[PDB]
Protein backbone atom coordinates (compact mmCIF):
# COMPACT_ATOMS: atom_id res chain seq x y z
CA UNK A 1 0.00 0.00 0.00
CA UNK A 2 1.33 3.39 -1.12
CA UNK A 3 -0.01 6.43 0.74
CA UNK A 4 0.57 10.12 -0.03
CA UNK A 5 -0.35 12.65 2.66
CA UNK A 6 -1.59 16.17 1.96
CA UNK A 7 1.09 18.85 1.81
CA UNK A 8 1.33 20.62 5.18
CA UNK A 9 -1.85 19.20 6.68
CA UNK A 10 -2.77 16.81 9.52
CA UNK A 11 -2.03 13.35 8.06
CA UNK A 12 -4.73 12.71 5.47
CA UNK A 13 -4.07 10.96 2.17
CA UNK A 14 -4.47 12.63 -1.21
CA UNK A 15 -4.58 9.19 -2.83
CA UNK A 16 -3.39 5.69 -2.00
CA UNK A 17 -2.58 3.03 -4.60
CA UNK A 18 -2.90 -0.54 -3.28
CA UNK A 19 -0.59 -2.19 -5.79
CA UNK A 20 -1.94 -5.75 -5.86
CA UNK A 21 0.80 -8.21 -4.91
CA UNK A 22 4.09 -6.79 -6.14
CA UNK A 23 6.36 -9.71 -6.99
CA UNK A 24 9.65 -9.88 -5.08
CA UNK A 25 11.66 -13.00 -5.83
CA UNK A 26 11.01 -16.72 -5.59
CA UNK A 27 11.97 -18.18 -2.22
CA UNK A 28 13.00 -21.84 -2.48
CA UNK A 29 10.75 -24.45 -0.92
CA UNK A 30 11.64 -27.31 1.41
CA UNK A 31 10.66 -30.81 0.33
CA UNK A 32 8.76 -33.41 2.36
CA UNK A 33 12.09 -34.75 3.62
CA UNK A 34 13.92 -31.51 4.44
CA UNK A 35 16.10 -31.07 1.36
CA UNK A 36 16.21 -28.25 -1.16
CA UNK A 37 16.66 -28.42 -4.91
CA UNK A 38 18.73 -25.46 -6.11
CA UNK A 39 20.04 -26.36 -9.58
CA UNK A 40 18.59 -29.84 -10.02
CA UNK A 41 20.79 -30.59 -7.00
CA UNK A 42 19.45 -31.71 -3.63
CA UNK A 43 20.90 -29.55 -0.87
CA UNK A 44 20.46 -29.54 2.91
CA UNK A 45 20.93 -26.42 5.04
CA UNK A 46 22.67 -27.50 8.24
CA UNK A 47 21.42 -25.90 11.45
CA UNK A 48 23.99 -23.64 13.08
CA UNK A 49 25.39 -23.28 16.60
CA UNK A 50 26.43 -19.72 17.48
CA UNK B 1 23.16 -22.81 27.59
CA UNK B 2 25.27 -20.12 25.92
CA UNK B 3 25.37 -21.91 22.56
CA UNK B 4 22.22 -21.61 20.50
CA UNK B 5 20.71 -23.47 17.56
CA UNK B 6 19.47 -21.74 14.42
CA UNK B 7 18.21 -23.72 11.41
CA UNK B 8 17.02 -23.15 7.85
CA UNK B 9 13.85 -21.21 8.64
CA UNK B 10 15.57 -18.71 10.91
CA UNK B 11 18.63 -18.16 8.72
CA UNK B 12 16.48 -17.72 5.60
CA UNK B 13 14.44 -15.06 7.41
CA UNK B 14 17.68 -13.17 8.08
CA UNK B 15 18.65 -13.37 4.41
CA UNK B 16 15.25 -12.16 3.20
CA UNK B 17 15.57 -9.40 5.80
CA UNK B 18 18.83 -8.26 4.19
CA UNK B 19 16.97 -8.51 0.89
CA UNK B 20 14.36 -6.00 2.04
CA UNK B 21 16.91 -3.53 3.43
CA UNK B 22 18.44 -3.09 -0.03
CA UNK B 23 14.97 -2.57 -1.51
CA UNK B 24 14.31 -0.12 1.34
CA UNK B 25 17.23 1.98 0.11
CA UNK B 26 15.65 1.95 -3.36
CA UNK B 27 12.11 2.59 -2.11
CA UNK B 28 13.07 5.77 -0.25
CA UNK B 29 15.32 6.71 -3.18
CA UNK B 30 12.35 6.84 -5.56
CA UNK B 31 9.95 8.36 -3.01
CA UNK B 32 12.36 11.32 -2.91
CA UNK B 33 11.12 12.48 -6.34
CA UNK B 34 7.83 10.71 -7.05
CA UNK B 35 4.81 12.32 -8.68
CA UNK B 36 1.22 11.58 -7.66
CA UNK B 37 -1.13 8.96 -9.19
CA UNK B 38 1.49 7.95 -11.80
CA UNK B 39 3.84 5.48 -10.09
CA UNK B 40 2.84 2.44 -8.05
CA UNK B 41 4.46 -0.07 -5.65
CA UNK B 42 6.03 -1.86 -8.63
CA UNK B 43 8.14 0.70 -10.47
CA UNK B 44 10.14 0.85 -7.21
CA UNK B 45 10.70 -2.72 -5.99
CA UNK B 46 13.38 -4.67 -7.86
CA UNK B 47 13.01 -8.45 -7.63
CA UNK B 48 16.40 -9.57 -9.01
CA UNK B 49 18.22 -8.11 -5.95
CA UNK B 50 15.75 -9.78 -3.57
CA UNK C 1 28.09 25.07 -15.10
CA UNK C 2 25.69 22.41 -13.78
CA UNK C 3 25.09 21.25 -17.35
CA UNK C 4 28.79 21.46 -18.29
CA UNK C 5 29.82 19.52 -15.17
CA UNK C 6 27.07 16.90 -15.41
CA UNK C 7 27.95 16.56 -19.11
CA UNK C 8 31.59 15.70 -18.49
CA UNK C 9 30.79 13.17 -15.75
CA UNK C 10 28.24 11.16 -17.72
CA UNK C 11 30.08 11.59 -21.03
CA UNK C 12 33.10 10.06 -19.27
CA UNK C 13 31.28 7.10 -17.68
CA UNK C 14 30.37 6.20 -21.26
CA UNK C 15 34.01 5.93 -22.33
CA UNK C 16 36.23 4.68 -19.51
CA UNK C 17 33.94 2.88 -17.05
CA UNK C 18 33.96 -0.28 -19.22
CA UNK C 19 36.76 -2.77 -19.77
CA UNK C 20 35.26 -3.40 -23.21
CA UNK C 21 34.48 0.15 -24.27
CA UNK C 22 31.05 0.53 -25.86
CA UNK C 23 29.34 3.47 -27.60
CA UNK C 24 26.85 5.66 -25.77
CA UNK C 25 23.98 4.47 -27.97
CA UNK C 26 24.67 1.01 -26.55
CA UNK C 27 24.50 2.28 -22.96
CA UNK C 28 21.10 3.85 -23.53
CA UNK C 29 20.00 0.77 -25.47
CA UNK C 30 21.06 -1.28 -22.42
CA UNK C 31 19.27 0.83 -19.81
CA UNK C 32 16.12 0.39 -21.90
CA UNK C 33 16.30 -3.36 -21.23
CA UNK C 34 17.08 -2.96 -17.52
CA UNK C 35 14.26 -0.44 -17.01
CA UNK C 36 11.99 -2.72 -19.07
CA UNK C 37 13.12 -5.82 -17.18
CA UNK C 38 12.33 -4.09 -13.90
CA UNK C 39 8.78 -3.72 -15.21
CA UNK C 40 8.62 -7.05 -17.07
CA UNK C 41 10.08 -8.94 -14.08
CA UNK C 42 7.39 -8.05 -11.56
CA UNK C 43 4.72 -7.14 -14.14
CA UNK C 44 4.65 -10.81 -15.21
CA UNK C 45 5.68 -12.68 -12.06
CA UNK C 46 8.21 -14.86 -13.85
CA UNK C 47 10.47 -12.63 -16.01
CA UNK C 48 10.92 -11.80 -19.72
CA UNK C 49 12.27 -14.32 -22.18
CA UNK C 50 14.91 -12.97 -24.63
CA UNK C 51 12.03 -12.74 -27.14
CA UNK C 52 9.50 -11.00 -24.86
CA UNK C 53 11.31 -7.70 -24.35
CA UNK C 54 12.19 -8.26 -28.00
CA UNK C 55 8.66 -7.05 -28.73
CA UNK C 56 8.61 -4.24 -26.15
CA UNK C 57 11.87 -3.09 -27.79
CA UNK C 58 11.85 -1.36 -31.17
CA UNK C 59 15.17 -3.18 -31.74
CA UNK C 60 15.55 -5.98 -34.35
CA UNK C 61 14.57 -8.01 -31.28
b or e along A26-49 (b: 16 or more beta carbons within 10 Å of the residue's beta carbon)? eeeeeeeeeeeeeeeeeeebeeee
Say whether C45 and A22 touch across the interface (CB within 8 A): no
Alpha carbon of residue C55 to chain centroid: 16
What is the dihedral sign for C-alpha B26, B27, B32, B34?
Answer: positive
Distance to chain B for C23, nearest Cα, Å: 26
> What are the backbone dihedrals phi and psi of residue A36, each rounded to the nearest 5 degrees, phi first?
-120, 150
Alpha carbon of residue A38 to chain centroid: 19
- Closest residue by Cα to residue C33 from C15, C17, C13, C55: C55
Interface subset of A 8-37, CB within 8 angstroms of B = 14-15, 17, 19, 22-25, 27, 30
Per-residue 3-state assignment (H helix, E strand, C coil) for B13-39 = HHHHHHHHHHHHHHHHHHHCCCCCCCC
Q: Which residues of A touch C44 (CB under 8 A)?
A: 23
Cβ atoms of C53 and C40 within 8 Å: the answer is yes
Cβ atoms of A13 and A4 within 8 Å: the answer is yes
Q: Which residues of A touch B5 (CB under 8 A)?
A: 47-49
Distance, in Å, from the CA atom of C61 to the CA atom of C57, rounded to the nearest integer, reads 7
Tell me how crowded residue C33 is: count the other CB atoms within 10 A of its CB. Answer: 15
Q: Does B7 touch chain C (CB under 8 A)?
A: no
Cβ atoms of A2 and A17 within 8 Å: the answer is yes
Alpha carbon of residue A39 to chain centroid: 22
Residues 6+ apart with CB under 8 A from C54: C61
Distance, in Å, from the CA atom of A40 to the CA atom of C22, rounded to the nearest integer, reads 36
Mutate to test the interface with A, among B40, B43, B48 (most CBs of A within 10 A): B40
Distance to chain A for C9, nearest Cα, Å: 33
Strand partners, A3: A16
Amino acid sequence: RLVIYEREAPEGTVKDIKEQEVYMGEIPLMTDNGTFVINGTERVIVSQLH
Amino acid sequence: GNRRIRSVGEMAENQFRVGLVRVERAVKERLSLGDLDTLMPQDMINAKPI
Amino acid sequence: ATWWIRQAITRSIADQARTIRIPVHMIETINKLNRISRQMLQEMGREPTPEELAERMLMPE
